[PDB]
Amino acid sequence: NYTYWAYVPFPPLIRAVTWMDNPIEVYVNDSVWVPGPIDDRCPAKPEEEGMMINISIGYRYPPICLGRAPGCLMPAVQNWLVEVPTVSPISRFTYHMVSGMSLRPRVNYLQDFSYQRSLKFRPKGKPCPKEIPKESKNTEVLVWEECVANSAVILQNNEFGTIIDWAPRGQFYHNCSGQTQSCPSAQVSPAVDSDLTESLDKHKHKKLQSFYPWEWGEKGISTPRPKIISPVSGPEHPELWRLTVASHHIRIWSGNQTLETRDRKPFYTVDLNSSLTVPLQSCVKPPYMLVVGNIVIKPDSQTITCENCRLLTCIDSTFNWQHRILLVRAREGVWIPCSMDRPWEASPSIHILTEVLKGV
């Protein structure tokens, strides 16, 4: 036998997409509520979705993984609020809120579960507005605009790397500056994870009541743009939220903030109600795919391993977050030795002359 080096331009292999890659395209099927790119078509091979595979690959830079496991970014609900000033003594604002599955910031357990913040590598861009716009227009239409927050939220800080996000995160809070010692300083999230899962036809109501007016911050209808800053510096990835947002329905809320009097003191109530949910679909296109299952990442050996993962193209609300998602792409050409039973030949010219002599 004779073993030679061979080059295979198109092997049936895959490699993980890492945080050092530039952003890829994720297509959603509904342009009313989510920005582009848009594709409403079903996957080209619907009968191939969910084919099982065992994977044991390496990487050079940290892979992009979503879910609840070491090395993967945790999903959680994010809220975006539109505030319309109201010229009235009873009602001060009207609200339009959107809730969807997004990326989860790390929690400051030292404080009252605030977000861990960072100020490193601030990007150029339009700052987030510190004041409510006075000219509302098209309240029925949601306008998404990129916005740079005052501080970045930390999504991950461990041996798998440091991931930070400069997009704003919105919550309800009280100013508390220049106030008496009864002003609470805790942040409040208006919607939680169960608001997207437990019921969909049932009406949802949220009521927030306090002695101080409710403020929304940080303002801005902006989506996450995470990036790695340690141990390597990579570009922002504004498409990862598109994968998580399709894993659940998005909830649309409406409501107002009103002023009344309780115990002879001003009282502020925020009411939010919802009876509308929208189902979405997010897909990637070849040569990109998604690996869904019990994905294990070992940073000491730089190995990605999974048993009985499924290969997918699209994420919808049937997705179960007991699994993780790994982004992969078809691999480039590879080199491998292979053996032959005869020596290497350039042409069959000598071979052709053999059958001529035997033909005679």
């Binding site: 004779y2 073993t3 030679y4 080096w5 061979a6 080059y7 295979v8 331009p9 198109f10 092997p11 049936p12 292999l13 490699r15 993980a16 890659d21 530039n22 952003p23 890829i24 395209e25 790119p37 594709d39 080209a44 091979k45 191939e48 084919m51 595979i53 065992n54 994977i55 044991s56 690959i57 390496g58 990487y59 050079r60 570009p235 296109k285 070849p286 040569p287 795919m289 730089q302 290969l311 193209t313 078809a330 691999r331 480039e332 050409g333 590879v334 080199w335 491998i336 292979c338 053996s339 032959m340 020596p343 290497w344 030949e345 350039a346 069959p348 010219s349 000598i350 002359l353 002599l357």
Partner: protein, 155 residues
């Protein structure tokens, strides 16, 4: 760089999953070139059967950085393939006349390369490509060997 392939026998998912079983043996030891041929056969067919770029999806692309980097890799791969010397009997992939040593390239390095690693224990592609280039000259391989000429010249 983006295609919608409705009328193909196998998509990307089926190609990847079906070949993974034979990929286990490919990671363990040297296989015959017929084994390698059958393993990459469907992948090569799929990447030779796309018709045109999906214009509905392509015109929506905003950041071109990932597409240009992908195209640069494919262009570089095609330039290197045009220069390779390959055995006549296999056309799906290229078998070069460079003999595998196994005293310079142990199998652990090859297995690491097959997994997509780039550490210092992995096979060095740039060093290998230089050896293959200065051994596959047309004036050393195109003319058949001395024994081959005398083997058929009996009659």
């Amino acid at each position: 760089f983006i295609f919608t392939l409705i009328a193909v026998i196998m998509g990307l998912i089926a190609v990847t999953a079906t070949a993974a079983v034979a990929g286990v043996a490919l990671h363990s030891s040297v296989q015959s070139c017929n084994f390698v041929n059958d393993w990459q056969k469907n992948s090569t067919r799929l990447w030779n059967s796309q018709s045109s770029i999906d214009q509905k999806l392509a015109n929506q692309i905003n950041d071109l950085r990932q597409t240009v980097i992908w195209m640069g890799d494919r262009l570089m791969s095609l330039e290197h393939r045009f220069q390779l010397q390959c055995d006549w009997n296999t056309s799906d992939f290229c078998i070069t006349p460079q003999i595998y040593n196994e005293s310079e390239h142990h199998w652990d390095m090859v297995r690491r390369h097959l997994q997509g690693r780039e550490d210092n224990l992995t096979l060095d592609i740039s060093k290998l490509k230089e050896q293959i280039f200065e051994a596959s000259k047309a004036h050393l391989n195109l003319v058949p060997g001395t024994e081959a000429i005398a083997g058929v010249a009996d009659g």
